[PDB]
C-alpha cells in the first residue's frame, strides 16, 4: 500500500487533507511526542498537564474509512511516566491501549485498520485509576475517518465542508489550598492526591474548549464567512457537552460522532457523550460574532466552555431586524 | 405580510393557534414585559426572580415555519438591571441577544424570520456571568414553529394534537446561611455572590417545573382525558433533564425538538439536553394519576421535578389488571 | 391463553428464551421476591440494599411483544417496609405501582400487556421520598420485550445474537461518618437521614454493575468469542451513563432502548438516560479482554462503573498490529 507521512498542527486546526479520498486505501503514517508539562487554565489555575504533542487536546488526526493508520508514539525521556494510547476508531487489545504502554525513554509503533467512518475520541489509558488521571490531565485529542466519498447528508446526498475546526472540550480538577487558592505542584505526582479528592466530587473546577478559558477567544477565536458550510468537530473524552451555535443551529448534525448514521437537522443544541466526538455543520448566514458554548451556561461562562467565531459578510435584514432600537 | 396579534397566557397552557397554519406567511406580533420579584420555590425557599412576563418559564409563542415574529420587550422602569433575549429558532446576532439589550425604562422591538420548524429555547443572555445568572434566576421561555402543514409522524403521515402542554424545567441554586436555612435578599444584586458560589457546585437546590415545587400538581395538575393525543414541549435552558410519564410513554418524541426530524416512537424516558426544548405527543389509553418528572428521581422527588396529569375515562383491564388484591 | 411459568436466574444472565417467538401470544408467569439486606459495595463499604429477588439488579425478564406478564411479588414478612413496582414496559397506574403496593407478609399479581417493544426499566416506587431512596437502595431491573420476529437492523433486515447480558448499573450514595469511614447500619431506615444527605448533593459514592464494585471482572467477568454477536442491555433507573466497551463499538445501538426505532451504528459510547435501559449489539472480531465501562473515567474508576469481557479467538494482525515493540 502507498504510505503517507502527514505533519499534524495544533488544533483547533487540521493537518492537509481532502474530504473525498484522492486514493484507494493508504497507511497514514502519524508521529506524536508526548509532553509533561504545566499549562495555564485560567488567571489563577495552572494544571500538571500530560499531552499528545504539547497540546491539549492533542492534534486531529484525518484519514479515510478503509485506510490503515501507523502512529509512532514517543515518551522522550524527561517525562515521569508510563503512556500509552486507546483509539475509539481502532478494533482490539482496549483499542491499542494494550500495545502502546511505553516508559520514559521509549517509543512504539501501532497500526490499525479505520474499518469505521466517524469522529472518534483517542486518549491516554495506562491502567486503573491512572486512567481518567491522564485524561483528566489533558491526555486526549480526535482522529476523524471520514467515508471515502465524503460525507453524506440525511439524504444520502453530497455535503462539503469549507472548513473543518476541531474543538476539543476537557474537563479538569484542580485542587485549592486552605485559603481557597488554586494549588501548584513540581509535577504531576505531587499534585496527584489533591486532584483525586476534587476527581471524587465529579464537578470540575474548569472545562475548557483548546486548553484554556478563553483559548479559542479574541486572537484565538474561530473565523469563517457568509456562506462558508463550516464543520465543528467536538469531542469530550470524559464527561458530557451540550455545544450550541448562538446565533446558529447545527444544520447537520451527528451527535454521537459516526458519519454513516443519518444526522439530525436544524439543532439548537447538540449532546456530546463523554467519552466521544460528534460533529455538526452549519453554513453561516449572518456576519458578525457567534459564541460556540457548552451549553449548561455555567459551565460555559463560570467553568471557561465558550469559545467565538468572527464572520465577515453581509447583514441580511429578512432573517434579523433590529425594527425599534432601545427608547424610553 | 398580514399581522396578527397574539395574547400570551401563562404556562403550562397556550395562546390560542392552529396547528395547521390557516394562511401563508404572516407577521407574529408578540409583548413582553420583564418583571423582577422574589418568587417563592418551595415551603423554605425563595429565589430573587427575573421573568419574561412575570412567569417561569417564559409563556409559550406559537408561530409556522417561514412566518415572522416580531418582539416588543420592555423592561419597566423598576427592574434593576438591564435584560435582553436570545431566541435559539432565529438566525444573528447571537439569537437576537446583541440587538435587544434594554435598561430599565426601555423598551426594543425586533423581528426574526422563524425559518426552522422545532420547539426552541428563548432566554435572557446580557453578557458575561450576566448570562447564567439570569437564566438561572428564571429567565428562559420557549417558541414553538410548526411545521405549516402540522406536525408528521416516522412515516411522514399527519399527526394531530388535541391539547399541547409546555412544560418549562428550571434549575436554581439558593443559597443557606449557617444554619441551613436557605437565604432570602432585598433584590437579585444582594444574592449575587452567595449565588454564585452554589453556581460552582452545579448543584441545583431546586429543579422545578412551572416555576416552583408542586406548581403543576394539585390544582396544578395538568388534565387529559382517555383518548386525548397530548404534546408534552419541555424546555431546559441550562441543564439536562429526562422526562418520563409514569404510567405512560413517547408515542412520537423529538427529544432535540426539531420536527422535521423523525421521532422515535415508545419511549419510557427521553432526554432534554440543556439549552434545547424536546417535544413528545402521548395518546392517553388509561384514566387516574400519572407523574410527569426528571427520572433522575432526586431531582424528581428531592428538589422538585414532579407534574402530575390526571385522566378521566374508563379502565381497560385487557392493559392491565389487579388479579390478585394485597393477600397475605 | 397458553401459560409459560419461568425461572428468573440472577444477572448478569438472562432466564431461557427464544428470540423470535415460538408462539403466538402468552401469559408470561414470574415470581419475585423481596429481599432487604445488608450488602458490600466494596472494600470499604456497604450499603442498606432493598431488592427484588436478592440481586442488584433485580432480574431480567424475556417477553416478546403482545404477550401478558402475570407478576407475583412477594414481600416476605421480615422486611421492614411497603414495596410496590412499576414497570416501564406497562400502560397505566404508575406502571402498576399504584395497584402493587404490599406490605411485609403480603403478596400480589399484577398482570399487564406488553404492547410496546423495547428494553424497559421496573423499579419499586412506594410513593414520594420512599421513590428515589429505594431505587437507589437497590431496588430496580430490567424486562425486555422483544419484537415477535426478532430483532432487525437498520434496513428491516433480522439479527441474531448469540449471547445476550444484562448489565444493571446503578448509583448509591453511602454517608461517611466523621472520620471519613463509610457508616454502617442495623436497617435501612437507621440509615435514611444520613443518606439523604449524600442524596441532595447529587453525587453518588458508587456507580456499579451487577450490584458491586468489580462484580463483573474477576470470576464474574462476561465471556465471549470471536464471532459472537452479544446483545448489551443497560439499565439506569435514576442517573445516565454513556456506555463503551474498550477495544470494541456499538455495531448497532439502541440507546434509548426501543427496538423498533432504527438502531445507530459504528458507536465508540452510547447513552443510557436516566429511567431506562438501552441495548447494543457487537459482533466480536479480535480475541482479549475488554472492558465495558461508563465513559465518564471517574465514574467507571473511581465509582466502580467498569466491566470486564474476556474473548476467546485468533487474533486478526490486519485489524491491529503493533509493528515495533516498545524499544529506546
Ligand atoms: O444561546 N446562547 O446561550
Ligand atoms: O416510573 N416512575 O419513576
Ligand atoms: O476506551 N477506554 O476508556
Ligand atoms: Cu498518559
Ligand atoms: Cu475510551
Ligand atoms: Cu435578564
Ligand atoms: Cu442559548
Ligand atoms: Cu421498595
Ligand atoms: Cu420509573
Redesign the interface.
Known sequence: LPRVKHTLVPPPFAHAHEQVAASGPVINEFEMRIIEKEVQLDEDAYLQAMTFDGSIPGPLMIVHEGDYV?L?LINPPENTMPHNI?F????????????????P?????????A????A??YHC?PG??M??WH??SGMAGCIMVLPRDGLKDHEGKPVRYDTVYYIGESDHYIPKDEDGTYMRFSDPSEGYEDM?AV?????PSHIVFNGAVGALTGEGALKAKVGDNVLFVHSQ????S?P?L????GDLVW????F??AP????????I?????GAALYKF??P????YVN????????KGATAHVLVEGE??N???????????
Open positions: 501507523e509512532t486507546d475509539h476508531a481502532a478494533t482490539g487489545a482496549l483499542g491499542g491501549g494494550g500495545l502502546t504502554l511505553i516508559n525513554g521509549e517509543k512504539v509503533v501501532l497500526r490499525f485498520k474499518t469505521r467512518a466517524g472518534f475520541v489509558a486503573g485509576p486512567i481518567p485524561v483528566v483525586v476527581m471524587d466530587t465529579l464537578i473524552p470524559n464527561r458530557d451540550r450550541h448562538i446565533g446558529g443551529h451527535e454521537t460522532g459516526k454513516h448514521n439530525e437537522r436544524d439543532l439548537e443544541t447538540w449532546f457523550r463523554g467519552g466521544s466526538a448566514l449572518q458578525g460574532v457567534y459564541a451549553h449548561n451556561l455555567i459551565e460555559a461562562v463560570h447583514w441580511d429578512d432573517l434579523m431586524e433590529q425594527v425599534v432600537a432601545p427608547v424610553g
